[PDB]
Short mmCIF file of N, CA and C in Angstrom, two decimals:
data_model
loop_
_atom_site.label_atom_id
_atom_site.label_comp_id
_atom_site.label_asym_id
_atom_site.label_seq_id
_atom_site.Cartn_x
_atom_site.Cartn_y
_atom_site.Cartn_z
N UNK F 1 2.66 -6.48 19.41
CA UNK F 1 3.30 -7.33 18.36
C UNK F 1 4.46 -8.10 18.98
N UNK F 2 4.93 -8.66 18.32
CA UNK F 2 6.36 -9.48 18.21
C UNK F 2 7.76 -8.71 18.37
N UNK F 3 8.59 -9.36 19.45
CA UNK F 3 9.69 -8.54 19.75
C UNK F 3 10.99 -9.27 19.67
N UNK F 4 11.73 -8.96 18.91
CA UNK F 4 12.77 -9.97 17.68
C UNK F 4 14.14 -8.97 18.13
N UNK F 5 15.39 -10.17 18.26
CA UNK F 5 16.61 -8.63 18.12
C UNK F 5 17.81 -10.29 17.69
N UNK F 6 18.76 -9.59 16.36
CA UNK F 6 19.71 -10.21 16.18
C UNK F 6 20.74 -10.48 17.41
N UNK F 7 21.71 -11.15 17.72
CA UNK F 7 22.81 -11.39 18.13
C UNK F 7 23.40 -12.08 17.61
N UNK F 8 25.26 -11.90 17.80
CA UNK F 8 25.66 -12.37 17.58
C UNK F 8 26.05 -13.45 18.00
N UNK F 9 26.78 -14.98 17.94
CA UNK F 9 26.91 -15.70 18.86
C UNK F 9 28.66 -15.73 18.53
N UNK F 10 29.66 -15.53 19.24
CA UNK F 10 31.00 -15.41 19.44
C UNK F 10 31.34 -16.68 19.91
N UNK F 11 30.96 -17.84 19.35
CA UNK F 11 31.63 -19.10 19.88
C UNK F 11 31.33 -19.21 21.45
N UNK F 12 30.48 -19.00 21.66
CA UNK F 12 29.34 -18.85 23.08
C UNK F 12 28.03 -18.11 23.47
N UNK F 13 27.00 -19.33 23.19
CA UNK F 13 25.57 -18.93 23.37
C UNK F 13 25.13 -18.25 24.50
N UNK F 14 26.57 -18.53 25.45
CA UNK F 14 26.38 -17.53 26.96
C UNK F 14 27.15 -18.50 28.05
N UNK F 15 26.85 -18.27 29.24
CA UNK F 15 27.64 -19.18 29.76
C UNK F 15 27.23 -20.60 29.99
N UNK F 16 27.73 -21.55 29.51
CA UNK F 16 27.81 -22.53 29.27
C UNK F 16 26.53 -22.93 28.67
N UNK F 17 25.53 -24.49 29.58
CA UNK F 17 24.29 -24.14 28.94
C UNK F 17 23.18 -24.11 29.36
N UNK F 18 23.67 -22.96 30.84
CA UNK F 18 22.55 -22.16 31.50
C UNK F 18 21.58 -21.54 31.20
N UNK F 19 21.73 -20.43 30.39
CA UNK F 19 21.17 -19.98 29.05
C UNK F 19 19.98 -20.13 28.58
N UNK F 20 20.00 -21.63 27.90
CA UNK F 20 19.41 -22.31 27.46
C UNK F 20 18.19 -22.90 28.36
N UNK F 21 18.87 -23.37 29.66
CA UNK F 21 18.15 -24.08 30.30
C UNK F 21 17.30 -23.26 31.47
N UNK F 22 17.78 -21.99 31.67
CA UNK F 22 17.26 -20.98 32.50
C UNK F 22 16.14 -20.11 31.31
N UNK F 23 16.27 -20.06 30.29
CA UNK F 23 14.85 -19.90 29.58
C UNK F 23 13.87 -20.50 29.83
N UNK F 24 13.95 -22.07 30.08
CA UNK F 24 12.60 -22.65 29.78
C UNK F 24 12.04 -22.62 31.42
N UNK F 25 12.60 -21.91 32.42
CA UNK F 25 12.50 -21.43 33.50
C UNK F 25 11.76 -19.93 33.49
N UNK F 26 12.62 -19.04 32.56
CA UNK F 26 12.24 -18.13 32.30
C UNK F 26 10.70 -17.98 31.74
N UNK F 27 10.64 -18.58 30.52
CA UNK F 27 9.65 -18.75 30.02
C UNK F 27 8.20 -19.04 31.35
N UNK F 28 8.57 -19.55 32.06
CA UNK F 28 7.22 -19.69 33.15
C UNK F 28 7.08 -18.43 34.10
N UNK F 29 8.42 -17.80 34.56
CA UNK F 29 8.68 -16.88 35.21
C UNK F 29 7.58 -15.21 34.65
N UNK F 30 8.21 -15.29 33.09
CA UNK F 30 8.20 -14.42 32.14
C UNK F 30 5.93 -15.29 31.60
N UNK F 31 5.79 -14.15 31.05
CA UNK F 31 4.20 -13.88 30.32
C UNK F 31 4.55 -13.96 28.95
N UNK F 32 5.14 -14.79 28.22
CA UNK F 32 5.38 -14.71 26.57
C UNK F 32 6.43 -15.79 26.28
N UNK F 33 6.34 -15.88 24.79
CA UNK F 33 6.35 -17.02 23.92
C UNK F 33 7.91 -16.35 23.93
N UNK F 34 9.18 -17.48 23.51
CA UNK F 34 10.56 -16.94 23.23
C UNK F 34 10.94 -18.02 22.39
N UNK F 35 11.15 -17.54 20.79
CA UNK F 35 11.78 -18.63 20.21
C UNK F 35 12.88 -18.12 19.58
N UNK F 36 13.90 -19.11 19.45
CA UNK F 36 15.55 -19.10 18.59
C UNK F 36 15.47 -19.07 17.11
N UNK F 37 16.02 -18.42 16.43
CA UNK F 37 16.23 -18.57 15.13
C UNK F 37 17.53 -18.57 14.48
N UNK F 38 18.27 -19.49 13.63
CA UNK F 38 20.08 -18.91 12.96
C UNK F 38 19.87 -18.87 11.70
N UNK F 39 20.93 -17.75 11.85
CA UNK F 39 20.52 -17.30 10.09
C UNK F 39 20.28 -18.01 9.07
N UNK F 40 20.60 -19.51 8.92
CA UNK F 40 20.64 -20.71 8.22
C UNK F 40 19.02 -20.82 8.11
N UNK F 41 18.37 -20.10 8.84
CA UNK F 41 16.42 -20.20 8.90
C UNK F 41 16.43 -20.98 9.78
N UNK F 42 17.01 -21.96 10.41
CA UNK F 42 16.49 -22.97 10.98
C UNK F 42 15.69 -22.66 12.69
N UNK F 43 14.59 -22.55 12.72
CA UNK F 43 14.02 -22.16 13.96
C UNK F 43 14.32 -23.22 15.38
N UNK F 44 14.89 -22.87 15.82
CA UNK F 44 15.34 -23.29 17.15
C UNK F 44 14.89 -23.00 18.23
N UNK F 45 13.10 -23.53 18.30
CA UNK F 45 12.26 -23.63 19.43
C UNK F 45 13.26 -23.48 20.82
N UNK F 46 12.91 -22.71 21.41
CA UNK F 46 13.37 -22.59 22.74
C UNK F 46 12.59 -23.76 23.41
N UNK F 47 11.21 -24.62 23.49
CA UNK F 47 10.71 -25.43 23.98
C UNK F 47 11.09 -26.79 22.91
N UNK F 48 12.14 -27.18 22.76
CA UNK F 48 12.48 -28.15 21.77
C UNK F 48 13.92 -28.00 22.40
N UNK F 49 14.24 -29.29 22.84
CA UNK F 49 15.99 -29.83 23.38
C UNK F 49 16.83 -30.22 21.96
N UNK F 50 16.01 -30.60 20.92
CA UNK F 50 17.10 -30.79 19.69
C UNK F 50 17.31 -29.16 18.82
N UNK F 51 16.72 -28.71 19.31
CA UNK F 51 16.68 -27.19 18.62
C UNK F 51 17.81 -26.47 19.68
N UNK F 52 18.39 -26.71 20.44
CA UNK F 52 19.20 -26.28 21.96
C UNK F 52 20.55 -26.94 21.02
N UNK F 53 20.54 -28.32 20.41
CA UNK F 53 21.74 -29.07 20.23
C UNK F 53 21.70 -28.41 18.83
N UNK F 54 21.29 -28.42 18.31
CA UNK F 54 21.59 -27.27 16.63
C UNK F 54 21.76 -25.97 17.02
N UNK F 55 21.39 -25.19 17.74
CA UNK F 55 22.38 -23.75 18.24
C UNK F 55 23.62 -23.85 18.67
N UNK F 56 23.76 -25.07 19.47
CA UNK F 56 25.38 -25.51 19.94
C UNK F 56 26.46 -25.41 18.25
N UNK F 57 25.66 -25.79 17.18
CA UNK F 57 26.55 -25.61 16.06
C UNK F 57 26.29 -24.27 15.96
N UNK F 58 26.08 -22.91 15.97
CA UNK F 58 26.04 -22.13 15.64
C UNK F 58 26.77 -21.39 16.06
N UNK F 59 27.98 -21.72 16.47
CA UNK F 59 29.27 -21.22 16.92
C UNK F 59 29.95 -20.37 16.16
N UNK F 60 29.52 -18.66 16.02
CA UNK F 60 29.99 -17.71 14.89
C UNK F 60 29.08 -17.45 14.61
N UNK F 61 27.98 -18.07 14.32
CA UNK F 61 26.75 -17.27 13.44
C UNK F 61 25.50 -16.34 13.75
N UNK F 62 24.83 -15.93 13.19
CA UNK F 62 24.33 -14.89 13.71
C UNK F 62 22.75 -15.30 14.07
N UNK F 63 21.67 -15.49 15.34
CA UNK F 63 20.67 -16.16 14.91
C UNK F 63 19.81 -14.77 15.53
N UNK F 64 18.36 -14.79 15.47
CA UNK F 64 17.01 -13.79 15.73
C UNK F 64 16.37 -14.52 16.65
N UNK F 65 16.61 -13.71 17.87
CA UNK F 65 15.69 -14.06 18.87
C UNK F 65 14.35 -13.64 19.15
N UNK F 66 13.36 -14.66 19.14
CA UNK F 66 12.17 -13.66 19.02
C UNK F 66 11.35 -14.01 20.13
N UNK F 67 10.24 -12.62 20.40
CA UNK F 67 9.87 -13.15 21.68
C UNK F 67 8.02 -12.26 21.83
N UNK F 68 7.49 -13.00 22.05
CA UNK F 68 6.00 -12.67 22.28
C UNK F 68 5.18 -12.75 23.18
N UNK F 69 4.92 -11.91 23.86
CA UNK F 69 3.77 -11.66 24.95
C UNK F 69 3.87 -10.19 26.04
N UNK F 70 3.41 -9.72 26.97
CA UNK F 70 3.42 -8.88 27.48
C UNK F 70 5.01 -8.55 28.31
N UNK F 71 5.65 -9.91 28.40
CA UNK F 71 7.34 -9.43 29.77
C UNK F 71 7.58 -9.92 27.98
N UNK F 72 7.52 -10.13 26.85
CA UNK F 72 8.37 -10.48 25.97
C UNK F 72 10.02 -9.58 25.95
N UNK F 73 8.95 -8.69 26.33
CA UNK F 73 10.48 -7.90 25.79
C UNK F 73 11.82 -8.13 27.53
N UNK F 74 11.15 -8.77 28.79
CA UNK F 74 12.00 -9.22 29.84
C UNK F 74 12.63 -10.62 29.23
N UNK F 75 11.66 -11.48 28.84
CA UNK F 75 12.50 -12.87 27.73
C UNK F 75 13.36 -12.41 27.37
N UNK F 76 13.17 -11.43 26.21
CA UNK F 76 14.43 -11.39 25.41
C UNK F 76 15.39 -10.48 25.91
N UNK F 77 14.87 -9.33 26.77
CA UNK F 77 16.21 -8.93 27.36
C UNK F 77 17.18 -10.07 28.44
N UNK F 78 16.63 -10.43 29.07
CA UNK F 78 16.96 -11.93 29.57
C UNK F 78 18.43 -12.83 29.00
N UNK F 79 17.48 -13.25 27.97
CA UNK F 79 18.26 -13.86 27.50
C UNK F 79 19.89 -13.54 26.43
N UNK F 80 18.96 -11.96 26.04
CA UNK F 80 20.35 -11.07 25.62
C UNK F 80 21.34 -10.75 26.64
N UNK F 81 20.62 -10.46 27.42
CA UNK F 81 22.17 -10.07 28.80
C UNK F 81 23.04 -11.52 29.22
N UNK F 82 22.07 -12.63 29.26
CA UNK F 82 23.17 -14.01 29.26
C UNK F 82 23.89 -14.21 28.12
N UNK F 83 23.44 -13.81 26.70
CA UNK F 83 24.46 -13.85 25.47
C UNK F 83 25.65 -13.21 25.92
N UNK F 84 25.35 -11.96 26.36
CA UNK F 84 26.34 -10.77 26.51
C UNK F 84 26.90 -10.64 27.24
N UNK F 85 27.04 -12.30 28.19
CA UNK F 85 27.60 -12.48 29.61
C UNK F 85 27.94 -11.33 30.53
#
């Protein structure tokens, strides 16, 4: 199945917007699908650059990272340990 975990975002999606841009790296590296979500619902395709500039507003809020395929759960740890600088 599908492997999903809240974070918080503390006025930094991680360091700077490596993050972001080392996913869609990741994503080839990694065997599975990784998409953004903020609590507002608004899904914030990790393969979508205007979905990257609407998380930049999400400075405080809380979004669901979700992630699908066999390393899914390396995606999203991944990308949780760059949240968690």
């Amino acid at each position: 199945m599908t492997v999903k975990q809240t974070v918080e975002i503390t006025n930094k999606l991680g360091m700077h917007a490596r993050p972001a841009m080392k996913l869609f790296e990741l994503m080839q590296g990694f065997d599975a699908e990784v998409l953004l979500r903020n609590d507002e619902g608004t899904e914030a395709e990790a393969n979508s650059v205007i979905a990257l500039l609407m998380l930049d507003s999400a400075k405080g809020r809380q979004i669901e990272v979700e992630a699908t395929g066999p390393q899914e759960e390396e995606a999203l740890a991944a990308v949780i340990a760059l949240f968690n600088s």
